[PDB]
Amino acid sequence: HWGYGKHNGPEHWHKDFPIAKGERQSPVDIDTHTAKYDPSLKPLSVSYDQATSLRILNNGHAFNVEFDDSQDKAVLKGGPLDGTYRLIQFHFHWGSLDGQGSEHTVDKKKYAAELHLVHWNTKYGDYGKAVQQPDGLAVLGIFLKVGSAKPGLQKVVDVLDSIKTKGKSADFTNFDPRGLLPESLDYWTYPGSATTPPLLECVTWIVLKEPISVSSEQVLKFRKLNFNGEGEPEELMVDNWRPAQPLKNRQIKASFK
Ligand SMILES: NS(=O)(=O)c1nc2ccccc2s1
Ligand SMILES: NS(=O)(=O)c1nc2ccccc2s1
Ligand SMILES: [Zn+2]
DSSP states (O other): OOOSSTTTSGGGGGGTOGGGGSSSOSOOEEOTTTSEEOTTOOOEEEEOTTOOEEEEEEOSSSEEEEEOOSSSSSEEEETTOOSOEEEEEEEEEEOSSTTOOOSSEETTBOOSEEEEEEEEEGGGSSHHHHTTSTTSEEEEEEEEEESSOOGGGHHHHHHGGGGOSTTOEEEOOSOOGGGGOOSOOOEEEEEEOOSSTTOOSOEEEEEESSOEEEOHHHHHHHTTOBSSOTTSOOOBOOOOOOOOOOOOSOOOEESOO
């Protein structure tokens, strides 16, 4: 199966998921000079006041914090989006060292990590139907740089010891994802894809310009997770990021001047 090892990493994925060479793959490099301000974009509406987290899972490629998406509670609207998108999970991608880890890049700069808050379009009724549609998902991407600690992240880092290996989960209720946002909601947006197999071309990307700061100690704890299952040879969960893909016939729009 696919992964981020020496023999099953991103350069191999196309053999089982041919869409990997498709026309709207993600992530991409964001060339800040070429991205054009679009005055027709609206402010984002991030409405997480009623978010209900449930569980955290090590799925062998990242850890997902899962939400109750059985009704509209935590939703994303506005910006480039038509309609309402429900938060289903968030996860991160990160590096073996601070100089890499993000999936999107900004003028070729790689950040230490990248947070993805994944939302599905409620007009399709369920998540599984939404991922089959070109406007089925909206992923809010947030860069992480290493500096001061992010207080709102600490509850996540502290549970990681309990989900070290693939297939382990833990209760994770009452977590407020608003504590993972930066101050500004200025963003770039473009049409793309999921960044892990099956790489479906169903995502409207909304990538925030302002990174959040996390401490070295916080990201070091991400790097103690394992890709492998319990009792298997230890493979540290690091460098679980897909590199930038060709932009092809796409424009990246900016919400800001
Ligand atoms: N990256 S993938 O095409 O999905 C894939 N790579 C490999 C390598 C060895 C054994 C099975 C698979 S499946
Ligand atoms: N990493 S991501 O683009 O946020 C993402 N990848 C996938 C793969 C399958 C289904 C949903 C998503 S959301
Ligand atoms: Zn992701």
